[PDB]
Structures are given as C-alpha cells and as structure tokens.
Amino acid sequence: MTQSPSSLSASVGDRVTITCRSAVAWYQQKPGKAPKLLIYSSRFSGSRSGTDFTLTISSLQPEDFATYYCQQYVSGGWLITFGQGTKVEIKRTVAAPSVFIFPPSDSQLKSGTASVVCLLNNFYPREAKVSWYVDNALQSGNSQESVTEQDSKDSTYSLSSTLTLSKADYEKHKVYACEVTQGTTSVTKSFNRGE
Amino acid sequence: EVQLVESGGGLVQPGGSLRLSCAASGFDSGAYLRHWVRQAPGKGLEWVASIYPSYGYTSYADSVKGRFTISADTSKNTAYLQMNSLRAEDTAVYYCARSAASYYGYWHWYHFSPGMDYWGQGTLVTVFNQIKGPSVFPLAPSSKSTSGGTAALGCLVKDYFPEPVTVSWNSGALTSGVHTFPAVLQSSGLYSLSSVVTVPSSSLGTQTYICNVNHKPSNTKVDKKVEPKS
Ligand SMILES: [Cl-]
Ligand SMILES: [Cl-]
Ligand SMILES: [Cl-]
Ligand SMILES: [Cl-]
Ligand code: NA
Ligand code: NA
Ligand code: NA
Ligand code: NA
Ligand code: NA
Ligand code: NA
Ligand code: NA
Known part of the structure; x- marks a missing residue:
C-alpha cells in the first residue's frame, strides 16, 4: 500500500496526519529499535477517509518523532502487506552547513583511485544540491551521497558527497570544488592539487 | 513481561541454508500467531511468513514461496524459519512478531485480525558472495x-x-x-x-x-x- 506524506516535518504539540491508500494497523519504529504497535481498526486516533485510511496525532510528543508503517491483513491467501512508510521529522530553524572538502590521501593514490569527499555538517532542512567541479567542469555520474539521521540533540542533518576518480584523471586536473546550494545561497569549498 | 527472542541469523553463501528460532516467554502460543517480518537495511518492512502454532497453518509471501518454510515446536513454545536457496536480496534483519488469534477469527475474519502487539529485537541474515575487509x-x-x-x-x-x-x-x-x-x-x-x-x-x-x-x-x-x- 501507498502512504501519502512519505516525509513530514512538524513540531512538538502539532496536529499530524499521514494517510494510507476495511481494517488497518499503524506501527511506530524508531531507528535501531523494533516496530511497536500503535492502534488497529491516546494522542493517536484512526480514521477511514473514503477508501483510504488515516492516522492522526494530536499533541505530538518528543517521543513520537519516528517512521510510521501502515499495515493490513489480506483475507485472501492469509497475506500481510505493509506501507512504504512515512517519516515525521522535527522542524527547527534553518541552519547553514559547515562545508569541508578533502583531497584524496596519498596512500589511496598509490592504489590507482582517488576519492574526493565533501562534507555538509549540521544543517537544516534536508534538501540541498551538491555539485562537483573539476577545473570548472561540472561532474556527472561519478559521485555518491550519504545523509545521517536527524541528530537527537540539535535536530540537524549531516551529509557526505563522494567523488570517485581514477588516479590518472585526478592528476590531470588542478582545481577541485564542492558547491552546496540551499535556497538563495551557495557555498563552495575548493583546493588546488598539491596546494 | 511478554518476551520474544530471535536467534540464528548469520553469514551464509548464496544457495545456502539457515534456520532461525523465536523463543517465547510469558504467553501461550495457539492463542497468538507468530509472524516473520524482515527489514532490509535502509528499507521498510516486508512480510515473510506467518504461522498459527497450535494448528500449524502456514502462509508465505510470494517472493518466499517454495524457498522458506515456517514451523513451530509446541513443546518449547518456539517458532522456526528455515531458509533455503538464498539469494542476495534476502539480506535483512528478521523480526519475529505475535498477534492475538482465534480459530474463527482466523478462518472467516482475517482482514480484521488484531495487530502485532509484541516484536522481538530481530536477527540479522547476511548473504555474502565474498568476504572482503576494508x-x-x-x-x-x-x-x-x-x-x-x-x-x-x-x-x-x-x-x-x-x-x-x-x-x-x-x-x-x-x-x-x-x-x-x-x-x-x-x-x-x-x-x-x-x-x-x-x-x-x-x-x-x-x-x-x-x-x-x-x-x-x-x-x-x-x-x-x-x-x-x-
Ligand atoms: Cl591510474
Ligand atoms: Cl560507485
Ligand atoms: Cl584553509
Ligand atoms: Cl587499510
Ligand atoms: Na581553514
Ligand atoms: Na594506506
Ligand atoms: Na595506530
Ligand atoms: Na581505492
Ligand atoms: Na573528471
Ligand atoms: Na551476495
Ligand atoms: Na569500532
């Protein structure tokens, strides 16, 4: 089944509704913990808007920030199906990322491949565009991103972008730049090969 | 109070074999179904199989049919998931969960089955085709x-x-x-x-x-x- 909001940002004490396309169950799972049953068919309350099913939280408490999974028992075949899952995240003020760029290590170069790593540290919200430039040519297809979960304390995200080059390509070029863009602002850290 | 503890997960080569256990402490099987539900790293929840321990009924996800079987030993109040013909996609954390059951609730009213009120912490299955350190x-x-x-x-x-x-x-x-x-x-x-x-x-x-x-x-x-x- 399909869950509508997929991701949602909300604050503590807010009315929260995620929907799900005759009987369903909702489960709460926090990272590294197991699913915990919430309700079937308390601040949690179910509904049945038309054919689709709805779960509403009234005064979102700091413990309810988690991922939510729709679930149903299919009568035919004795099946169970789950929803794709909806994640409720803590809204906070915007926070610009501290941006850092890392040349490949010399040890790695000996092996014939060059990883260049860009870091976006402790920022909010999650959406950000990260773009690699080698001597001002925008890179495509040679990079991979990874993002942490929302930090329990300051409620922000960290992100890593990793550019993978052959050592031969890396030594052909001079300026390496990581440009990170959020809304009306862009921040670009860079280095010349060899300093 | 209610305890459900899963064991057996480990490394296994493709086309290999594994068997998990789910030990129960604090309730009576027969009045509670047991369900295997697996979560691939970074992904969500996917039902694997379910069983009614007192009566020995089984149902399987289509992606598992003909590869895994599920069972319960009524003597020790433990349920078993034996897995064969493994392929890379089977890597997951394998939770075992319980849900209140009834012969009638099962035969005629499965859509309205009560939720899975207790879940174990899960056991990890890693299918590997090589072992390479970092x-x-x-x-x-x-x-x-x-x-x-x-x-x-x-x-x-x-x-x-x-x-x-x-x-x-x-x-x-x-x-x-x-x-x-x-x-x-x-x-x-x-x-x-x-x-x-x-x-x-x-x-x-x-x-x-x-x-x-x-x-x-x-x-x-x-x-x-x-x-x-x-
Ligand atoms: Cl090379
Ligand atoms: Cl890659
Ligand atoms: Cl500097
Ligand atoms: Cl090493
Ligand atoms: Na500096
Ligand atoms: Na090294
Ligand atoms: Na050392
Ligand atoms: Na390498
Ligand atoms: Na290049
Ligand atoms: Na594999
Ligand atoms: Na360590």
Missing part, C-alpha cells in the same frame, strides 16, 4: 592548526563486503561531534562509508586522532592515525 584512508584535517577555528577530519573506509562495519574515534573516547555515515553500495558491488568529526584547530598537533574500524565478517579491525597534511 581499506581505511585518512581524511586529513581541513585546517592547519593556525587556522584558529574548527577543523574537520575523518576516515574513508571503502571496498569491504558484506555489511556491516562499525566506527569509533579514539577507542570511543571521542563521540561528541562524530558523524558516521550509512554505507553506500558502490558500482563495484563493494560498500564504502565515511566517518568524520569536528575538533578545535588548536588541538591538531597536540591531540592525536585515531579512527577504529571493525569489520566482524572478516574478523578485522583497522586503527588509522589521522595526521595533518604538511
């Missing part, structure tokens, strides 16, 4: 210790298989400001990951920084000192 490269500090503010530094751990890998800083002395990112599957089919930390620039050259990477599938631990570049 390479660990320093992400050398972004400042020169005269820069006078915050520096970032890190470890790149790459080209290892299968998951997982755990990272710590200064044997776990350093945890404030650490970020260890989820691993990514590279196009070589090997996982790669990065772990970073922010520290005061002035501390570079006084304080040593060592990341500790532990790859239990290869029984390997690597300690890397991250030094400033020049």
Whole structure:
C-alpha cells in the first residue's frame, strides 16, 4: 500500500496526519529499535477517509518523532502487506552547513583511485544540491551521497558527497570544488592539487 | 513481561541454508500467531511468513514461496524459519512478531485480525558472495592548526563486503561531534562509508586522532592515525 506524506516535518504539540491508500494497523519504529504497535481498526486516533485510511496525532510528543508503517491483513491467501512508510521529522530553524572538502590521501593514490569527499555538517532542512567541479567542469555520474539521521540533540542533518576518480584523471586536473546550494545561497569549498 | 527472542541469523553463501528460532516467554502460543517480518537495511518492512502454532497453518509471501518454510515446536513454545536457496536480496534483519488469534477469527475474519502487539529485537541474515575487509584512508584535517577555528577530519573506509562495519574515534573516547555515515553500495558491488568529526584547530598537533574500524565478517579491525597534511 501507498502512504501519502512519505516525509513530514512538524513540531512538538502539532496536529499530524499521514494517510494510507476495511481494517488497518499503524506501527511506530524508531531507528535501531523494533516496530511497536500503535492502534488497529491516546494522542493517536484512526480514521477511514473514503477508501483510504488515516492516522492522526494530536499533541505530538518528543517521543513520537519516528517512521510510521501502515499495515493490513489480506483475507485472501492469509497475506500481510505493509506501507512504504512515512517519516515525521522535527522542524527547527534553518541552519547553514559547515562545508569541508578533502583531497584524496596519498596512500589511496598509490592504489590507482582517488576519492574526493565533501562534507555538509549540521544543517537544516534536508534538501540541498551538491555539485562537483573539476577545473570548472561540472561532474556527472561519478559521485555518491550519504545523509545521517536527524541528530537527537540539535535536530540537524549531516551529509557526505563522494567523488570517485581514477588516479590518472585526478592528476590531470588542478582545481577541485564542492558547491552546496540551499535556497538563495551557495557555498563552495575548493583546493588546488598539491596546494 | 511478554518476551520474544530471535536467534540464528548469520553469514551464509548464496544457495545456502539457515534456520532461525523465536523463543517465547510469558504467553501461550495457539492463542497468538507468530509472524516473520524482515527489514532490509535502509528499507521498510516486508512480510515473510506467518504461522498459527497450535494448528500449524502456514502462509508465505510470494517472493518466499517454495524457498522458506515456517514451523513451530509446541513443546518449547518456539517458532522456526528455515531458509533455503538464498539469494542476495534476502539480506535483512528478521523480526519475529505475535498477534492475538482465534480459530474463527482466523478462518472467516482475517482482514480484521488484531495487530502485532509484541516484536522481538530481530536477527540479522547476511548473504555474502565474498568476504572482503576494508581499506581505511585518512581524511586529513581541513585546517592547519593556525587556522584558529574548527577543523574537520575523518576516515574513508571503502571496498569491504558484506555489511556491516562499525566506527569509533579514539577507542570511543571521542563521540561528541562524530558523524558516521550509512554505507553506500558502490558500482563495484563493494560498500564504502565515511566517518568524520569536528575538533578545535588548536588541538591538531597536540591531540592525536585515531579512527577504529571493525569489520566482524572478516574478523578485522583497522586503527588509522589521522595526521595533518604538511
Ligand atoms: Cl591510474
Ligand atoms: Cl587499510
Ligand atoms: Cl584553509
Ligand atoms: Cl560507485
Ligand atoms: Na594506506
Ligand atoms: Na581505492
Ligand atoms: Na573528471
Ligand atoms: Na551476495
Ligand atoms: Na581553514
Ligand atoms: Na569500532
Ligand atoms: Na595506530
């Protein structure tokens, strides 16, 4: 089944509704913990808007920030199906990322491949565009991103972008730049090969 | 009170075999169904199989049919998931869960079955086609210790298989400001990951920084000192 909001940002004490396309169950799972049953068919309350099913939280408490999974028992075949899952995240003020760029290590170069790593540290919200430039040519297809979960304390995200080059390509070029863009602002850290 | 404890997960080659146990403590099977539900790393929940222990009824996800069987030994109040003909996609954490049941509730009213009120912590199945330990490269500090503010530094751990890998800083002395990112599957089919930390620039050259990477599938631990570049 399909869950509508997929991701949602909300604050503590807010009315929260995620929907799900005759009987369903909702489960709460926090990272590294197991699913915990919430309700079937308390601040949690179910509904049945038309054919689709709805779960509403009234005064979102700091413990309810988690991922939510729709679930149903299919009568035919004795099946169970789950929803794709909806994640409720803590809204906070915007926070610009501290941006850092890392040349490949010399040890790695000996092996014939060059990883260049860009870091976006402790920022909010999650959406950000990260773009690699080698001597001002925008890179495509040679990079991979990874993002942490929302930090329990300051409620922000960290992100890593990793550019993978052959050592031969890396030594052909001079300026390496990581440009990170959020809304009306862009921040670009860079280095010349060899300093 | 109610306890459900799963065991048996481990490394296994493709086309191999595994059997999990789910031990029950505090309730009576027969009045509670047992369900195997698996969660692939980074993904959501996928039903695997279910069983009515008192009556021995079974139902399977289509993706599992003809490969896994589920069973319960009524004597020890433990349920079993035997898995065969494994393929890479079967890697997951395998939860065992219980839900209130009734002969009639089951035969005629399955759509309105009560929810899965207790779940175990899960057992991890890793299907591997090779075991490769990691390479660990320093992400050398972004400042020169005269820069006078915050520096970032890190470890790149790459080209290892299968998951997982755990990272710590200064044997776990350093945890404030650490970020260890989820691993990514590279196009070589090997996982790669990065772990970073922010520290005061002035501390570079006084304080040593060592990341500790532990790859239990290869029984390997690597300690890397991250030094400033020049
Ligand atoms: Cl090369
Ligand atoms: Cl190494
Ligand atoms: Cl600098
Ligand atoms: Cl890759
Ligand atoms: Na090395
Ligand atoms: Na390499
Ligand atoms: Na290039
Ligand atoms: Na495999
Ligand atoms: Na600097
Ligand atoms: Na470790
Ligand atoms: Na060392």
